[PDB]
Homo-oligomer: A and B are copies of this chain.
């Protein structure tokens, strides 16, 4: 009954992240909201690998080394990381994003469980499940910005002729 329920859940969320491929910024937000209710986190932050560093702008912009701290490790290693006690902190569930291959393309971390000591070791396969849709959507979402950006500059020039 639960298993069946975390799909309709995901079915939902899949259909919500895919209605924002338009805006990597709105999309990036959705991923956060959704990621927070799905796992029931106090807070989620999302980092998008920018070459050799993590950028979770999430509004300001926050750079940092891609291999530094929690985010950096998980990003480096490409494998989830669960924390019971981190030592209003407490716990942290942090997971990779990776693209079509398995190239971690971003990273997200949830802090503190609501109604709980930590993250259900089920809150991981569910996070991994979600995390496929985040990588699928971020990947295309960025790949679509690149075009629109370029293609725009292309005409800024052409209206010049």
Contact = CB atoms under 8 A, between A and B. Distances in A.
A51 to B, nearest CB: 26
Interface of A: 4, 7-8, 10-11, 14-15, 18-19, 21, 136, 147-148, 151-152, 154-155, 157-161
Nearest to A21: B21
Contacts of A11: 7, 10-11, 14
A38 to B, nearest CB: 15
Contacts of A18: 18
Contacts of A155: 151, 154-155, 157-158
A137 to B, nearest CB: 10
5 contacts: A7-B8, A151-B154, A155-B158, A158-B161, A161-B161
A64 to B, nearest CB: 32
Contact of A158 (B7, B10, B19, B157): B157
A154 B158 CA distance: 6
